[PDB]
Design a protein around this ligand. Structure first.
Ligand SMILES: Nc1ncnc2c1ncn2[C@@H]1O[C@H](COP(=O)(O)OP(=O)(O)O)[C@@H](O)[C@H]1O
Lengths: 17, 452, 220
């Protein structure tokens, strides 16, 4: 019976031009 | 002659068409040789130094693959997602405009030209995982014939009388609650009824959900999980394949999650093909609200093993194809089936015998009426299957040690002893939850229980 | 043989997260596909079996469960025998008591230290458990003994022996070293409730039948 707060974890992403 | 290529976009009444080429759109003119109306949207065309379309080829077969998200209301454009989670809106090709395209399909696309040309087939494994193979027939279960007939009456009867209900403007009952003893064959009846229903319409899905693992205590997440389960059930019911939603160990649960479950059951009541089957070993602890008339009207009580069923179960497990000792064959002049039947009768009789080898449980009462339960009680199909597996292992050990193949009653007795020793621990720690677990079956509360 | 160690890290569950959520499905599918092969075996180990979702542990893929209980007096004697080898130097005072019979001296020492460790002396009290309905419960060190602790006891005894041969010049090993190692290990682990495990508390609750209310660390 309690609430939570989220911390994100960024995922790798890369593009060319 | 050096000739380029491009992608057609659309036609016009002035015999001029737009073509994407070299990264830019150009309004080319069609040569008199080709027919402008014959051109199809998205068809690759051939250019030349004068930028005139003279030939039209096939559709492109190489490029990026994007997952379809939705089809727009116009019927000519679709919204898809790229490899980098980038969404785009692209026009569909003529071949894409039975078969019906569905969300989740993979399509070959060209981002620069903004066209989708072909669909790449893909095989999904989620559908196979979610369902079970209808391999459990009526003959696969033994000693539950009256339960089989009750299930038949509860399930298959409205199917033959659907027009009767339609004329009478009524709602056939779609709620079956299987309540009985500790897990022996309670879920196997669900597999049997699913297989029987699959047989009648001659593809089959069985969504099994456990009770304790469904609980998401913290804040209202269990309602979310139940809603997701019922949404998946609705999605499966969209396809014309019968789906049975089974809930196991529902005595753990039941201002609470009960109203959400009732609302979902009422919502799924419209889908009469879907059959909800619940299992619980404690009918007393189950809240009577779910037992109210309407949804879960049909309740079926099951038990164990009438000894004959154990024999039937042994025949199902210890078939005629198992190796048999020559010495035991000497007692039955080489009749394998008769030898197997006699061995099954012998082992069942010994197991259900009140002897010194059946001191599994000692029961004490308030007045001190200390009695002894034997191996006949608490017998179960899973326990018999484990006994069969241990007996096979012991027979293999005897074959690899002594060298003589075959089966002996000593193997069955050793398997029985070892499996009862193993089963003395899982349900019986004897301080918690054992009192009710034995009192419901016996019929009276027991003050103290001990294991001998 | 594929060995999935510390199965709490991955394949644990997906509902409680507070992609990692997309690891169980493909693993289960691959295990189902490879099940047909006769010679492929999957082995997994984990301290906390509760964190593992039962879906991978359903009959089929993971059909065998093996529980490794904490050692008892006989198991402790066997483990000490596995570590207190005759190749370790033994002091002349203890060796002469058996007329050079190394095996007899070693086994007598093992029995003595096992009896000392498992004895219910007042110095061996570790924890006090409070029950609302019941009076109370007392837990000693033997309830949380393990082979690793035995190995560390032997190592500490050998370290004490090395310090003794450096300080006095007499090579060998003594029973006093083992007793000092035992008491030092008990004092060192007295403060930390680390020895307790959720499995241990589940077993204690299923033995008493009442939920724990309070745990106290006894100390002189
Ligand atoms: N009449 C029967 N014939 C064959 N097998 C049976 C019979 N009754 C029970 N069993 C076996 O007992 C096992 C119990 O499986 P399941 O129903 O999943 O667990 P539980 O009995 O705890 O619900 C099944 O695998 C089934 O093979």
């Amino acid at each position: 019976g309690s609430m939570a707060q989220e911390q994100t974890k960024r995922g790798g992403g890369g593009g060319d031009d | 002659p050096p000739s380029g290529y491009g992608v057609l976009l659309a036609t016009h009444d002035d015999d001029t068409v737009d073509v994407f080429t070299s990264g830019r759109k150009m309004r080319l003119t069609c040569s008199p040789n080709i027919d402008a109306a014959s051109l199809k949207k998205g068809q690759t065309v051939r250019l030349n130094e004068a930028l005139t379309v003279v030939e039209a080829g096939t559709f492109e077969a190489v490029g990026e693959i994007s997952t379809l998200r939705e089809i727009l209301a116009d019927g000519h454009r679709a919204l898809v997602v790229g490899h980098a989670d980038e969404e785009r809106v692209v026009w569909l090709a003529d071949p894409l405009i039975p078969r019906k395209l569905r969300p989740g399909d993979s399509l070959l696309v060209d981002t620069k030209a903004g066209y989708a040309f072909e669909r790449i087939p893909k095989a999904e494994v989620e559908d196979l995982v979610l369902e079970e193979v209808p391999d459990v027939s009526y003959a696969d279960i033994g000693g539950l014939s009256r339960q089989i007939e009750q299930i038949r009456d509860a399930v298959e009867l409205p199917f033959l009388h659907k027009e009767l209900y339609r004329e009478y403007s009524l709602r056939p009952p779609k709620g079956v609650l299987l309540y009985g003893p500790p897990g022996c064959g309670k879920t196997l009846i669900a597999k049997a009824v699913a297989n029987s229903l699959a047989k009648k319409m001659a593809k089959s899905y069985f969504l099994n959900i456990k009770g304790p693992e469904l609980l998401n205590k913290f804040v209202g997440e269990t309602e979310r999980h139940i809603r997701l389960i019922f949404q998946r059930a609705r999605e499966k019911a969209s396809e014309g394949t019968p789906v049975i939603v089974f809930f196991d160990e529902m005595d753990s649960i039941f201002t609470t999650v009960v109203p959400q479950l009732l609302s979902e059951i009422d919502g799924v009541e419209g889908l009469e093909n879907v059959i909800v089957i619940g299992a619980s070993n404690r009918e007393d602890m189950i809240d009577p609200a779910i037992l109210r008339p309407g949804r879960l009207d049909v309740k079926i009580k099951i038990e164990r093993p009438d000894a004959e069923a154990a024999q039937d179960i042994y025949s199902k497990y210890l078939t005629e194809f198992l190796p048999v000792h020559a010495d035991d064959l000497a007692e039955f002049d080489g009749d394998r089936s008769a030898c197997i039947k006699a061995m099954i009768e012998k082992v069942v009789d010994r197991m259900y015998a009140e002897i010194d080898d059946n001191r599994f449980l000692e029961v004490t009462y308030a007045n001190g009426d200390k009695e002894v339960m034997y191996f006949k009680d608490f017998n179960s199909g899973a326990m018999i299957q484990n006994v069969v597996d241990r007996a096979k292992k012991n027979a293999i050990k005897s074959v690899l040690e002594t060298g003589q193949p075959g089966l002996r009653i000593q193997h069955l007795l050793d398997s029985i002893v070892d499996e009862f020793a193993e089963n003395e621990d899982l349900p019986n720690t004897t301080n918690p939850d054992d009192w009710a677990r034995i009192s419901g079956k016996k019929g009276e509360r027991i003050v103290y229980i001990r294991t001998l | 043989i594929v060995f999935f160690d510390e199965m709490d890290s991955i394949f644990r569950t997906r509902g409680t997260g507070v992609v990692e959520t997309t690891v169980v499905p493909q693993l289960l599918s691959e295990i189902d596909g490879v099940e047909g092969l006769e010679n492929v075996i999957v082995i997994g180990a984990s301290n906390r079996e509760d964190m593992i979702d039962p879906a991978i542990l359903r009959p089929g893929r993971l059909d065998v469960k093996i529980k490794i209980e904490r050692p008892d007096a006989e198991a402790a004697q066997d483990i000490y025998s596995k570590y207190l080898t005759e190749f370790l130097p033994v002091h002349a005072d203890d060796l002469a008591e058996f007329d050079g019979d190394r095996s007899a001296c070693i086994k007598a020492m093992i029995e003595k230290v096992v009896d000392r460790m498992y004895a219910e002396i007042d110095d061996n009290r570790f924890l006090e458990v409070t029950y609302a309905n019941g009076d109370k419960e007392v837990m000693y060190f033997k309830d949380f003994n393990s082979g690793a602790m035995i190995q560390n006891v032997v190592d500490r005894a050998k370290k004490n022996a090395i310090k003794s041969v450096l300080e006095t010049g007499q090579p060998g090993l003594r029973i006093q070293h083992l007793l000092d190692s035992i008491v030092d290990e008990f004092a060192e682990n007295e403060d930390l409730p680390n020895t307790t495990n959720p499995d241990d508390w589940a077993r204690i609750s299923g033995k008493k039948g009442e939920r724990i209310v309070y745990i106290r660390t006894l100390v002189t």
